[PDB]
Amino acid sequence: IIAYTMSLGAENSVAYSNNSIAIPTNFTISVTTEILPVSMTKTSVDCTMYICGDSTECSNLLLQYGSFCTQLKRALTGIAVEQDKNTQEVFAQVKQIYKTPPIKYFGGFNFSQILPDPSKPSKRSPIEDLLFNKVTLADAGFIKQYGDCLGDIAARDLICAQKFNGLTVLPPLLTDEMIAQYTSALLAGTITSGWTFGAGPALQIPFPMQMAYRFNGIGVTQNVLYENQKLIANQFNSAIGKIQDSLSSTPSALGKLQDVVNHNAQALNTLVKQLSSKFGAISSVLNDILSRLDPPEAEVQIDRLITGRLQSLQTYVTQQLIRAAEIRASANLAATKMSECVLGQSKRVDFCGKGYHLMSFPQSAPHGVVFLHVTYVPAQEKNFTTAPAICHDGKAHFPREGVFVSNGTHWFVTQRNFYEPQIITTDNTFVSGNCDVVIGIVNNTVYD
Amino acid sequence: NFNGLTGTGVLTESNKKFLPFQQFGRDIADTTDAVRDPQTLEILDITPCSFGGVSVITPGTNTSNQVAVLYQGVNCTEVPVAIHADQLTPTWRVYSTGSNVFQTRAGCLIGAEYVNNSYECDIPIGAGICASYQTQTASQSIIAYTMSLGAENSVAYSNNSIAIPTNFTISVTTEILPVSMTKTSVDCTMY
Amino acid sequence: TPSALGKLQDVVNHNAQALNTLVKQLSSKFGAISSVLNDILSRLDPPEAEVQIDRLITGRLQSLQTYVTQQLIRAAEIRASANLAATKMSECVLGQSKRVDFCGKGYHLMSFPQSAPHGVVFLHVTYVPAQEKNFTTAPAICHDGKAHFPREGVFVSNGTHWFVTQRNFYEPQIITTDNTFVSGNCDVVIGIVNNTVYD
Amino acid sequence: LDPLSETKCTLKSFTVEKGIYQTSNFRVQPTESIVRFPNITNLCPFHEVF
């Protein structure tokens, strides 16, 4: 063991200067996996089953509370309907279920890793298959045969013990297949039409032209895409494959959803174990008190046990409500991320992945969602000399949509997020003002 | 009751390896799951009696009184009630028969006629099945159907085809958001 | 539609259901022989009465804690909406938001606020296209040795002539030198097509 | 009496709106048996005194 002071990352020093400007000459399409929880386990409880233990003598004494138990039941039902609404609002954003057409060459892009594969049930993609295989649910809320809890309880089938006390998990409204259908529809819409199927009717347009408009939305002109279309397609495919391999080998990919389900299961398990705890009484079973102690004090003891277990249920409900508020914030964030990155091109930084966002793709994760953020990122930059203006004839020429540069004895104009020198022309440079107000203006010609 | 240990359940004769010094068995959740006969040596697993929650599906009372029932997390092949009116007291309400049962992944739904026609989910039951008091059965009754996720559609994606609108529409939607709750106050001693 | 303002009506309903239930909790005989204090002091002596009153104090206190806890949680939900309304106000009203599906469904033109009891209402105006047509698109136009790309619109042809126009409104205008920008030759483009340009 | 009645009692209202408004209760089955096993453990010398 060795202790040390944490490092804040590798040091760096930008070679700043009054006439130094760096511009990219190449770039790279990166993909990042952003996971967000969208729902949690639904629950429903019987007060008497949890507390009394199927005893009529304790029931009416538990009915002396009445409202207390019902408040919790209503809160749990509210949490459940809220999880359902969260799923609906995160996935069911479009009412038209688009179908993917027979895949034709998309200018180079291969979506086979995120499209639904008909070679297996559930009509989902390989990445979604991996995501489903990563997360394991203690109780999905599905149908369980009566023979399940009838023997061979050596496994971690605590669900039997949790159901013996009213605690039972329900199945979500929208099955995994419906979420997969919504995801496939969104993917087909974004790859066939672009940002139009979110505002209204689906307007078809080639995926190359879609990506060209994406690029135009972050400075890089359409030519940067058309003249490097094959390289960009190869980069996209390689990044998709690398993300697949990472999510496959990296066990901590879906750690957030795993921790969500683990927290829910652990809360249920501890709430169950609380039953075996002596809440100041002589025994954990009310029948023992009824058979050993007299009614005068047995009633007080039963009231004590009931208050203790009701407080346990209240603590559980409060923790679940706080976690549900968290997951609701996460679901709203996921819906916003969908609407922005998936259904459009977002300008917000660090919201649709690291770097300039081009487009995103959703994947149906268990109790959550995984966004594959496609971004545009420069690389292998180079240094050039800059000049805020160009003086040609007693007037200053300023850039229209780019920046000036100089490779030495010659001067050119180019854009910011990419290197594409062009001669200083009158169309490229607007003229306004003399050459005496500018501080770093340089004398150079403006072609006509 | 065997040696002072009372309870209720179903015995299923397991072959659990109880040692000579072991007379009771508790599962992972500190719950009894097996016991030994105080006389013989047979190990009997204490399995739970028939148990399952019921959910009452009811349309608007102003509409009608016909109601459906769902035994969540139970297979129809089990014993929902199936009593002779002299078995269990707390649930005298019997809906064993009716010739209308549909086993969903969420439970046995009694009182609803399953239909292959997918509509918009009105009353969410679970596992995709939703109910409604549709009047297209014409008579009216409670039905069940897999929720319709939406209207099918497709886009003729082509490497050289584009769509450009010709007219527009100024839609005026609405949104509602709570801003402030009721400000209350309490007097500890008076309450 | 009578259920339009349900989101707001739920608030005043829960706030009422929170206090109304809190009043019925006074009838709960928390480990006591009676839920009315005056009946205890009238039926039992202080030594034995405190053994009962001390219990009612706990339950009635937990009922307030159970009440104040939920109000705090509910208070957090309102602020989240108030912050969203405060943001949706500044973004949708005080300006034009490019955030899709935030200031209504569709391209945001403008929004108008309307006050409401314990809430707020936003009238979102959106630009939704309709009655679209299908045309043939070409990523570029190959002129005499050079490819011309669209400056801001997109190229289209009705089958016999080529025109450029914006994406969200069909306004075909001729391919002009000022409507296009030239970058490189034609061999580098995949689906480029040949068509003249007007100088 | 009937499900529509056990839900009103929980909702505390004679009118029930549309939905699944109540998970009324759960299913159970009663039983009966005896106590104080076993018996073959031993005899008693009571006969020695009588």
Write the DSSP string, B152-165.
Answer: EEE----TTEEEEE
Helix (H) or strand (E) holding C180: strand C180-182
Neighbours of A277 (CB within 10 A): 13
Cross-chain residue pair C128–A65, CB shorter than 8 Å: no
Resolution of the solved structure (Å): 3.6
Test the B interface: residue of C83, C111, C132, C195 with most B CBs within 10 Å: C132
Backbone angles phi, psi at C64, to 5 degrees: -75, -40
CA gyration radius for chain D?
Answer: 27
Query: Residue B6's closest CA among D35, A134, A29?
Result: D35
* Residue pair A226/C139 in contact by the 8 Å Cβ criterion: yes
* Residue pair A277/A284 in contact by the 8 Å Cβ criterion: yes
Q: Furthest-apart CA pair in chain D: how many Å?
A: 77
d(CA A205, CA A223): 17
* Residue pair A172/A83 in contact by the 8 Å Cβ criterion: yes
For chains A and B, tell me whether 3 or more CB atom pairs sit within 8 A of each other.
yes
For chains C and B, tell me whether 3 or more CB atom pairs sit within 8 A of each other.
yes
Neighbours of A29 (CB within 10 A): 21
- Out of B159, B165, B175, the one facing C124 most closely (by C-beta) is B175
Cross-chain residue pair A158–B28, CB shorter than 8 Å: yes
For residue B46, list its beta bridge partners. Answer: B11
Helix (H) or strand (E) holding A246: helix A229-249
d(CA B46, CA B26): 10
Neighbours of A22 (CB within 10 A): 12
Residue with the two structure tokens 């100089």:
A406
Query: Residue D25's closest CA among D3, D50, D40?
Result: D3
d(CA C150, CA A396): 29
d(CA A382, CA A24): 6
Return all residues near A66 (Cβ < 8 A) that are at least 6 apart.
C24, C28
d(CA A293, CA C57): 26
Q: What's the gap between Cα A304 and its chain centre?
A: 45
d(CA D20, CA B126): 11
Cross-chain residue pair A96–B149, CB shorter than 8 Å: no
Burial B51-82 (b: 16+ CB within 10 A, else e): bbbbbbbbbebeeeeebbbbbbbbeeeeebbe
Q: H helices then E strands: how many in chain D?
A: 2, 2
Return all residues near C123 (Cβ < 8 A) that are at least 6 apart.
B172, B173, B174, C111, C112, C113, C114
Backbone angles phi, psi at B54, to 5 degrees: -115, 140
How do beta strands B123-126 and B113-114 pair? unpaired
Return all residues near A245 (Cβ < 8 A) that are at least 6 apart.
none
Test the C interface: residue of B179, B189, B191 with most C CBs within 10 Å: B179
Sequence letter at residue A18: N
Query: Residue B150's closest CA among A182, C197, A135?
Result: A182
Helix (H) or strand (E) holding A391: strand A390-391
Query: Residue C73's closest CA among A71, A270, A320, B178?
Result: A320
Neighbours of A328 (CB within 10 A): 22
Q: What CA dihedral angle connects D16, D17, D18 and D23, to 10 degrees?
A: -50
Residue with the two structure tokens 């971004």:
A375
Neighbours of A319 (CB within 10 A): 14
CA gyration radius for chain A?
Answer: 31
Sequence letter at residue B152: E
DSSP H stretches of helix in A274-294: 286-292
Token duo for residue B136 = 């297209």
Q: Is A91 on the interface with B (CB under 8 A)?
A: no
Cross-chain residue pair D26–A73, CB shorter than 8 Å: no
Q: Which chains touch A (3 or more CB pairs under 8 A)?
A: B, C, D
Cross-chain residue pair B164–A203, CB shorter than 8 Å: yes
Cross-chain residue pair D28–B51, CB shorter than 8 Å: yes
Query: Residue B28's closest CA among A157, D24, A61, C171?
Result: A157
User: What separation in angstroms does the CA of A196 have from each of A189, B44, B161, C105, C152?
Assistant: 9, 66, 15, 11, 17
For residue A405, list its beta bridge partners. Answer: A412
Cross-chain residue pair A223–C183, CB shorter than 8 Å: yes
Token duo for residue B20 = 């000579």
Cross-chain residue pair A206–B160, CB shorter than 8 Å: yes
d(CA A259, CA A266): 10
In the DSSP assignment, the letter for residue C173 is B
Sequence letter at residue A83: Q
Which burial class, exposed, middle or buried, applies to A390 when counting CB atoms under 10 A from its CB (0-12, 13-18, 19+)?
buried
Token duo for residue B22 = 């072991």
In the DSSP assignment, the letter for residue A275 is G
Sequence letter at residue D25: N
- Out of B160, B173, B175, the one facing C137 most closely (by C-beta) is B160
Q: Is A70 on the interface with D (CB under 8 A)?
A: yes
Cis amide leading into D38 (omega within 30): yes
Backbone angles phi, psi at A152, to 5 degrees: 55, 60
Tell me which chain C residue has its CA closest to the CA of residue A343. Answer: C100
CA atoms within a 13 Å half-sphere pointing along the CA-CB vector of B176: 13
3-state SS assignment for residue C149: strand
Return all residues near A218 (Cβ < 8 A) that are at least 6 apart.
A345, A356, A357, A358, A376, A417
Residues of chain D positioned with their CB less than 8 A from the CB of A77: 23
Backbone angles phi, psi at A24, to 5 degrees: -75, 145
Helix (H) or strand (E) holding A397: strand A396-399
Q: How was this entry determined?
A: cryo-EM
d(CA A413, CA A1): 57
In the DSSP assignment, the letter for residue C182 is E
Cross-chain residue pair D26–A166, CB shorter than 8 Å: yes
For residue A106, list its beta bridge partners. Answer: A109
- What strands, in cross-sheet order, belong to the sheet with A422-423? A403-406, A411-414, A422-423
* Residue pair B178/C118 in contact by the 8 Å Cβ criterion: yes
Return all residues near A331 (Cβ < 8 A) that are at least 6 apart.
A36, A37, A38, A39, A86, A87, A89, A90
Query: Residue A245's closest CA among A67, A21, A31, A7?
Result: A31
Sequence letter at residue D36: R
CA gyration radius for chain C?
Answer: 35
Which region holds residue B9: left if phi is over 0, alpha if psi is between -120 and 50, else beta? left
Sequence letter at residue C99: R
d(CA A394, CA A6): 57
d(CA A193, CA C129): 14
d(CA B111, CA C78): 40
Query: Residue A107's closest CA among B84, B26, C192, C97?
Result: C192
d(CA A408, CA A237): 39
Query: Residue A337's closest CA among A348, A327, A326?
Result: A348
- What strands, in cross-sheet order, belong to the sheet with B113-114? B113-114, B143-146, B129-132, B123-126
CA gyration radius for chain B?
Answer: 28
Angle at B104 between CA B101 and CA B106, to 5 degrees: 120
Token duo for residue C139 = 């990523």
Return all residues near C102 (Cβ < 8 A) that are at least 6 apart.
A336, A339, C88, C91, C92, C108
